[PDB]
Homo-oligomer: A and B are copies of this chain.
Amino acid sequence: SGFRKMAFPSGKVEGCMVQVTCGTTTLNGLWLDDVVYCPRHVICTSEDMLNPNYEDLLIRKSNHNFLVQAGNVQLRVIGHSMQNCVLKLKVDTANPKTPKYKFVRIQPGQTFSVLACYNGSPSGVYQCAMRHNFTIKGSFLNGSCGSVGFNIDYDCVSFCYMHHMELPTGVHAGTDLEGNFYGPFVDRQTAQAAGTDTTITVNVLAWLYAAVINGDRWFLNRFTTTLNDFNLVAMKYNYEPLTQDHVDILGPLSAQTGIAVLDMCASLKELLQNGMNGRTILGSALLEDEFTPFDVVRQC
């Protein structure tokens, strides 16, 4: 019993974190086989934060300009190249702790675990969702760039996020491990702001099903609605429209609890219109949207 925000065990990723220093700039890098991946703005200079041209900056760099440390063991850089917004540093030693891994790009609504790192050293782990405006609401201080986000499948680490920057509203933006930013953001100091965000409806419903599995039942009712009439009220409260594929994904949860997905939609409709009236659901007083249906099935 119980339902908690839960992250993946981080040991397989801890073994890959290193420190990358260029000049007087230090951030974290990810060491897999004989390549270190890190954000390219580690080569940025003070008088270049305006309109930096990273191709120019990198052509003016040599291998000895990059200092890489794995613990108290300096790694010798023997090649460098740029892969969109990430830098690839070829080193003379393959990481013996390299796990089976994949580079994957996630979608809005999907979750992953973040290993927050400072100076190549892991300090904490937490769970995050990619929002609809391609930001994440993380916890990141100065020096955290290069921290990575990941999912684990059996023994395989699917790397999906590298941290690059913080936006004015305090949310966070980054890239996949191929260097392609999530969302319309660039790695230079401009007036870029996040677009408007929406509530992830399929995740809220999954979370309601986790509530029922854990004995919270006060929000249920005898009403049932159509998918169409549910989406009408969803738009009014800035929720994502529900699709048939979203109903299918909720199938297993619906079967386990004996509660039809559209029955649970009818409950969510009433929660939006009347609120909670003081009561809580799984220890929360608002509707949580950062648990996928997979996260719920795994934990319950």
Q: Which residues of A contact B (CB under 8 A)?
A: 1-12, 14-15, 115-116, 122-128, 137-141, 166, 170-172, 214-215, 280, 283-286, 298-300
Q: Is the CB of A9 within 8 A of B170?
A: no
Shortest distance in angstroms between A59's beta carbon and chain B's nearest beta carbon?
Answer: 34
Q: A9-B124, A10-B11, A286-B280 are in contact. Are A4 and B170 (CB under 8 A)?
A: no
Q: How far is the CA of A35 from the CA of B183 in the complex (A)?
A: 51
Q: Is the CB of B138 within 8 A of A4?
A: yes
Q: Is the CB of A9 within 8 A of B125?
A: yes
Q: Is the CB of B14 within 8 A of A11?
A: yes
Query: Which residue of the partner chain, among B9, B137, B141, B284, contacts A14 with CB atoms under 8 Å?
Result: B9
Complex copy number for this chain: 2
Q: Is the CB of B8 within 8 A of A5?
A: no
Q: Is the CB of A2 within 8 A of B139?
A: yes
The DSSP consensus for interface residues of chain A is loop
Q: How far is the CA of A11 from the CA of B17 in the complex (A)?
A: 12
Q: In the complex, what residues of B have CB within 8 A of residue A115's CB?
A: 9
Q: A1-B170, A11-B12, A139-B299 are in contact. List 16 more A-B contacts (CB 8 A).
A: A2-B137, A2-B138, A2-B171, A4-B127, A4-B128, A4-B137, A4-B138, A5-B5, A5-B126, A7-B124, A9-B11, A9-B122, A9-B125, A124-B298, A125-B125, A170-B214
Q: A2-B137, A139-B3 are in contact. Are A285 and B285 (CB under 8 A)?
A: yes
Q: Is the CB of A7 within 8 A of B125?
A: yes
User: A7, A8, A170, A286 — which one has the most chain B CB atoms within 10 A of its CB?
Assistant: A7
Q: Is the CB of B166 within 8 A of A4?
A: no
Q: How far is the CA of A122 from the CA of B283 in the complex (A)?
A: 25
Shortest distance in angstroms between A185's beta carbon and chain B's nearest beta carbon?
Answer: 16
Q: How far is the CA of A300 from the CA of B116 in the complex (A)?
A: 13
> Which residue of chain B has its CB nearest to the CB of A280?
B286
Q: In the complex, what residues of B have CB within 8 A of residue A286's CB?
A: 280, 284-285
The 3 closest A-B pairs by CB, nearest first: A11-B11, A285-B285, A1-B170
Q: In the complex, what residues of B have CB within 8 A of residue A137's CB?
A: 2, 4, 283
Q: Is the CB of B122 within 8 A of A6?
A: no
Q: In the complex, what residues of B have CB within 8 A of residue A172's CB?
A: 2
Q: How far is the CA of A116 from the CA of B9 in the complex (A)?
A: 9
Q: In the complex, what residues of B have CB within 8 A of residue A9's CB?
A: 10-11, 14, 115, 122-125
Q: In the complex, what residues of B have CB within 8 A of residue A1's CB?
A: 139-141, 166, 170
